[PDB]
Every structure is written in structure tokens, then in C-alpha cells.
Amino acid sequence: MALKRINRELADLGKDPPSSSSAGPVGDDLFHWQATIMGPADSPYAGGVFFLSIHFPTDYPFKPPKVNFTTRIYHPNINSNGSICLDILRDQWSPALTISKVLLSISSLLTDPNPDDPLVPEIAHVYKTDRSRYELSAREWTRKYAI
């Protein structure tokens, strides 16, 4: 049940992809995927490319996958190690969700950072107090790392 579903997800991505984000098994191991996210053009991360590592647990689709960032991003909800626990992947998970919905949710999160879950309190404070400084810092980081 944990392999036919993953094959179906890969086939669906190979037919009608989001055309911006991409996914693929690393070498030949269906339980370890690489993903690429294009920075949204309406957010300070525009022009950047981000890489994600997705681990599919054996209990898939009952248990959500584990996604971790690889490139550092100045975000109030992404820490230095780059871990996102957002409820689609820890609490609000149902078997009907696919891996493309997760990527769409993350690409939406890269535009509306959460203020009330200050995973990085310094960055959250900068965001809540000095919006212009926050956006300038985010663009500086995106130029610095995401290239």
C-alpha cells in the first residue's frame, strides 16, 4: 500500500505538474525524494530556488512525510536546520492529501509567514516591528544563499 500510492503520486506529477515545483526520487529509492521550489515572484524570495528532502514513512499515506529544507531561508517559521512542522504534515493529515498539495502549501507559506508561531523569535520580532527591514533582510538572504 506504501509503494503503489507513491508510484501513483509520481505518475500524477509526471502528467500535470505544478510546472514550478518539481519532485523526484534520489537515484533509485522511492522513499527518499528531492523537491525543488521556485521562489514566489510576489514575495521577497523571488528569483530563488529552494531544495527540499522528503522522507516517506512506511505507514504512508496514514502518516505524513517528513520534509526538510536544504537551503537557508530568513523565515519566521523556518529554523536554521530548516524544519517545517505545519499541521498539514503533523496534525491535519488525511490519506486523501498528496505530495503536490504539500508543495503548494509550502510555496504559499513562503509568502505569508506565520506571526503567532515565532519559531525564530528574532526574525518574528523584526517582522512584527520593522516590516521594511524584515523584507530587506529576507531579500538579502535570498540573494546570499538561494542562488
Add this chain to the structure above:
Amino acid sequence: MQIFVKTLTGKTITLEVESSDTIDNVKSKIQDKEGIPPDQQRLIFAGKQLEDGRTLSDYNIQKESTLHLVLRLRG
């Protein structure tokens, strides 16, 4: 008018509202039709999150507008 909502599982919801109707009224209608509390409802239109205290026309919502229900931010 009529608007369309795509949920997490692919279910499509049709809502009979008006652009002058407030966000609170639309969320109340959605809760009545589905049972999802308005606070837990995160509807994205044109890549932006709608907020209470306003109307649909305040977000440039028109006939047969498409909304996507997404998951709340916890990070």
C-alpha cells in the same frame, strides 16, 4: 452570485452569496453548509488570505470566483 471552493480532498463546494456580503456572513454560510468553524477555515483567493470584518468585494471577488481551502499556519 455563486462562488466555488476546492477543499483538501478535492470536494467542490458551491456557495450562493453576494459581493456586498460580509466575510462573516460568507463564513457563517460555509460553516452551516459544511460544519467547519470559520476560525479553522483558511480560504486563499488569488494567492491571498481573506480576513474577517470585510466583504467579498473588498478582495476583488467576482462571479464564480475560485477559492482554495488550505491548512492553517503553525510551522
Add this chain to the structure above:
Amino acid sequence: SHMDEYQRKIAYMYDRPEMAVNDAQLQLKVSRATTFEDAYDIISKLSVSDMKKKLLIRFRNEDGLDYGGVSREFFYILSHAIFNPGYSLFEYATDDNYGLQISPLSSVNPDFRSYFRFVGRVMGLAIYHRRYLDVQFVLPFYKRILQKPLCLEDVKDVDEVYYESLKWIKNNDVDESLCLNFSVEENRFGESVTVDLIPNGRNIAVNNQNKMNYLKALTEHKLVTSTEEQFNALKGGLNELIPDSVLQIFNENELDTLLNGKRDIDVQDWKRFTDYRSYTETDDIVIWFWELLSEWSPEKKAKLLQFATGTSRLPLSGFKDMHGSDGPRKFTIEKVGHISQLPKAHTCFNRLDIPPYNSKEELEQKLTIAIQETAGF
């Protein structure tokens, strides 16, 4: 009152003629460092008649009085040794929700039956001689020991997300978009192997007319069929001393109390293994917080722990080996927010944001109000 009825049951159980100890004394000597090896060497050879005599325990090269405390310390060490997941016998149900259960991989050993019979003998010895372990299994384990039917709700104790997904499948309809079928993939030492819930199960898709049978088979396989031989050996070892007609007067909670005593959360370990952000050990909001945690009942402490971390269960070694959503993440106290706001909790990071209040009464009121909706123990 639950406590009075439980005491009546305990007295009736220990007054039975088939659970009466003898007068001769059995001296059981174990070295402190190698507790597990010597315990398995001695216990796994004792006769049932020998195990019913008075249990006298003396650690090697440690002469002292109050043998009761020595025996209690020995049972604590043995229970924290044999049930430790690193020994590849038991395992946590989930990393972020610490619940012990029999590990399916434990079958890799050439003879797991001897080890699990030893574990059963240890548990029977602990119950028989009025000594408490300190492990905390999951409710399905106790329901199995008493031979109770296991249903879907029992998966809630084991894994919350798994139970939520199963309930989702039960409630909403299932299409062909979900490529679900009667087979479970298990990764045993790298290689992934497929187990058929029903014969020729990998070629049967779960329509809307099969999802109930699919849920039944999944629950049975997850909770029972994966650990048949090992649990059979363990229960044989346990029933060697305690006849099954005696255990079947309790339930899944009274048996837990009998095995582990009254569950409590230590405060000294909690204080010694916490960290602060923007706070210092000499700050008033910390000393007041620890005084309040000192003079609190165990139920409210468990409620606070579940409110902050997310679960009311602790790892086998206290707060030292505490895991978060992403990895090791000890209990953290942070100064975040305005005075008026209630204390908040980030569960996936084990963080408690406590604003800088002005008096201990205010902190007590805010902290008691902020955890009302939480349920502990």
C-alpha cells in the same frame, strides 16, 4: 471511589491461597553494573516453587540494612534495563509520544522466546512480591494481557495520527484515487517486505464496500498479529506465577496501577533538565514557577506537561532523553508576549512562553486558567 474499590480488589487478590509466599528466604545476588546479564542468568533458571519464597536481594560488595529499599532499587534498575528500547526488545510507539510496546523486529534474535519468558517472569515477580516497576506501556498491551477484544479506538493510545487517518477512512468515502489495497509494507533491516492482510491481498483494492473489513484487518495486524510468538512467550512466563484467573478481576487501568504504582511526575529532574531563553535561573518568574510546580498535585502537573509538550508520557529516562517533533528538544521556558496574555505553548518544540508577570498569585492564576481545556492522566 475508585481508590477504595481498587484497594478492596488488591486485598482480595493478595489474600488468595494460591498467591501466598513461604517462609524460607531466597538470596538473589546481582552486581550493580551488570544487572541485566546476572538477572537473566539467575531468574531464567529458578523453579516456580523457588520463586514463591521471600525475595532477598543483596548487591555485590554493598553490605547494608533496609533490604526493602535495596530490592526496590534492584527492580527499578531491572525494569529500566530490560524495557529499554536500545536493547531491541521493546520500542516506543512514536518518537514524540513515548509509549512502550513489543518491537516486531525483536524476532531477528535466534531465540526471543527465552528473553520474553524472562520478561514475563520479571513482571510476575514484581506483581507477586508487591514491588513496582516504572515503565509505562500502552493500553492495548494491558488489554492483551487480560484477553480483551481490541477495537479501532485502541489505536488512539498507540498512535494519534494513525487513528485519525483510520477514522477518516471510516467516515468519508474512499475512491480509486487513493491507491490503497489489502497489503502492508514493512521495512525490516533496510529491505521492505509486503504482508497480505487477506489471501491474494495485494491485488484487491479497497472500495467503499470493503473499507470496514480493511480497517478491522489493519487494526488486528497492527495491534496483535505482528507480535504473536513473542507475546505468547511473555504471557506464558507471566502466567507461570500468577494464574490467569487472578489477573482477570482488574481492567486496563487497575493492572497498570498494580504494575507501576501511582503514576507521578518528578519535579527535581524536570528542573535539572530544562533550559531558558531570555530567562535566567535567578529570575523571579522561574523561582515562582518552580515553587508552584513543587506544591501541585500530580494530575495538574500532568495537565501542564501535556499542555506544553503535547503528551503526558515521558521517556524511560526522564527529561534527559526528551525528543521533540524534529529531534532532541528539552523543555524550554521563554519570555515571550505581553503581561495580560496567558502563557502559551509550542508543542512541537516543547516550549512554554511565560510573560513577565508581577506576583506569584498572578502567575498561578494565569497558568491554571491556561491549561483548563487540557486533560492529563
